[PDB]
Amino acid sequence: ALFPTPLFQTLYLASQSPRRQELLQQIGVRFELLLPRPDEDAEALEAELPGEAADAYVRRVTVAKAEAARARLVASGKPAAPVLVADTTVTIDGAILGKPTDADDALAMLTRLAGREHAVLTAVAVIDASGELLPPALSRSSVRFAAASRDAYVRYVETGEPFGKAGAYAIQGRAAEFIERIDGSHSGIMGLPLFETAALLRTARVAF
Amino acid sequence: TPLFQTLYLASQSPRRQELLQQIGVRFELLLPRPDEDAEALEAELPGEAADAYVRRVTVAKAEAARARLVASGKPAAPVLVADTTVTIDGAILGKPTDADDALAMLTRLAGREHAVLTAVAVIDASGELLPPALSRSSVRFAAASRDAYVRYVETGEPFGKAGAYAIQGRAAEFIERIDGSHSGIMGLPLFETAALLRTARVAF
Numbered sequence: 340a341l342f343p344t345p346l347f348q349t350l351y352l353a354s355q356s357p358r359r360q361e362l363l364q365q366i367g368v369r370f371e372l373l374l375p376r377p378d379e380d381a382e383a384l385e386a387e388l389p390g391e392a393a394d395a396y397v398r399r400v401t402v403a404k405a406e407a408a409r410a411r412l413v414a415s416g417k418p419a420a421p422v423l424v425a426d427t428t429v430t431i432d433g434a435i436l437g438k439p440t441d442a443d444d445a446l447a448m449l450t451r452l453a454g455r456e457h458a459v460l461t462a463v464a465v466i467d468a469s470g471e472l473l474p475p476a477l478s479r480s481s482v483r484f485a486a487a488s489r490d491a492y493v494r495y496v497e498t499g500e501p502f503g504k505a506g507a508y509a510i511q512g513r514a515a516e517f518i519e520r521i522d523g524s525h526s527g528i529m530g531l532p533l534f535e536t537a538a539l540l541r542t543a544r545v546a547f
Numbered sequence: 548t549p550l551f552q553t554l555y556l557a558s559q560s561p562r563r564q565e566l567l568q569q570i571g572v573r574f575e576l577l578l579p580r581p582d583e584d585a586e587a588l589e590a591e592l593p594g595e596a597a598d599a600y601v602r603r604v605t606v607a608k609a610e611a612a613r614a615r616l617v618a619s620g621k622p623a624a625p626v627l628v629a630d631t632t633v634t635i636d637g638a639i640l641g642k643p644t645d646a647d648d649a650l651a652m653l654t655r656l657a658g659r660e661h662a663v664l665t666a667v668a669v670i671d672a673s674g675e676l677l678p679p680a681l682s683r684s685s686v687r688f689a690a691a692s693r694d695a696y697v698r699y700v701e702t703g704e705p706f707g708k709a710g711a712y713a714i715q716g717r718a719a720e721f722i723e724r725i726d727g728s729h730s731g732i733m734g735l736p737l738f739e740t741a742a743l744l745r746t747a748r749v750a751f
Binding site: 340342367485511512515516517518519520521522523524525533534537 | 716717721737
């Protein structure tokens with residue numbers, strides 16, 4: 340691993356996520372948010388295709404996010420620097436789990452995860468300062484939930500933590516009470532795998 | 548039913564304090580008094596296994612925390628302690644003594660798998676020491692390079708941590724993979740800790 344001398348003090352972060360922001364701060368990366376303009380439909384890039392495996396999906400979506408972020412940068416007229424994006428999916432038996440629509444949905448997702456392993460996959464992509472897409476990296480992790488009990492899961496849902504979370508849980512919150520083990524990358528599970536992200540940032544000559 | 552709204556955490560570690568707050572548990576602290584040699588509790592025994600070491604030190608911390616509670620005159624409530632060690636090739640790696648020691652530790656961990664063992668113990672409000680729990684994790688470091696380890700030591704992040712790295716900091720850059728518990732590696736394994744706290748009737 341040969342790290343060339345850095346040329347860029349600041350990275351453009353094309354992410355609204357507080358977790359991804361926190362994880363960049365954890366490795367000492369300075370960043371400027373570069374968020375989708377009012378006229379951009381950022382949600383459209385995240386639609387799945389049919390029969391598409393989860394690893395294929397998250398990679399594809401991450402590449403599109405990267406391309407949209409770079410086009411955003413060109414149109415802003417702001418000075419050239421690398422741009423970063425990422426995407427995360429939570430799956431069990433190949434099925435993608437989204438955010439619960441209500442308490443009963445949250446309960447049903449958690450009872451599905453309970454007593455089993457599931458996979459959390461995060462892809463990260465960086466477009467360098469000259470506009471070249473670097474190879475996206477995929478972080479694969481598994482997460483084991485205790486069987487616990489229905490009442491234990493109801494009690495968790497009643498805290499409200501499941502809402503807005505893919506798979507009805509957050510690893511960095513109260514759900515840690517049910518997580519027996521993980522295998523892979525805790526930062527990856529949270530939405531930005533730091534080993535692979537650091538590597539892309541050294542390649543893109545970002546100082547940290 | 549939970550009976551206690553709060554417990555005592557007998558720990559000076561910012562990481563253990565943050566982790567406990569993460570699961571929504573309210574806590575006061577029982578910190579060592581200035582004239583209490585808290586460091587001597589962590590002395591290894593000659594030829595002692597890492598596993599036995601962390602267990603034994605955690606029971607000793609629990610009993611010193613019991614005496615602190617008693618001395619303080621504060622009300623009965625549960626008491627929580629934990630201890631963490633890093634091990635590779637059967638050897639125990641503690642907190643580095645200086646920058647040279649931190650570099651020697653990291654050089655020993657580079658390109659290899661090591662284990663991080665954290666024991667946790669709770670004394671319930673009645674004064675009964677519950678069975679301790681042990682969280683075992685493994686961590687894989689990339690080879691990286693001497694130079695890259697030198698720069699990391701330069702940041703100061705190795706100091707105060709067993710094995711001379713902080714998983715929740717810049718060291719994440721050379722950690723390829725973990726298996727076990729990220730909170731356990733940081734010093735308070737939340738799965739095992741939560742279970743003890745439910746048994747001790749702490750509200751959260």
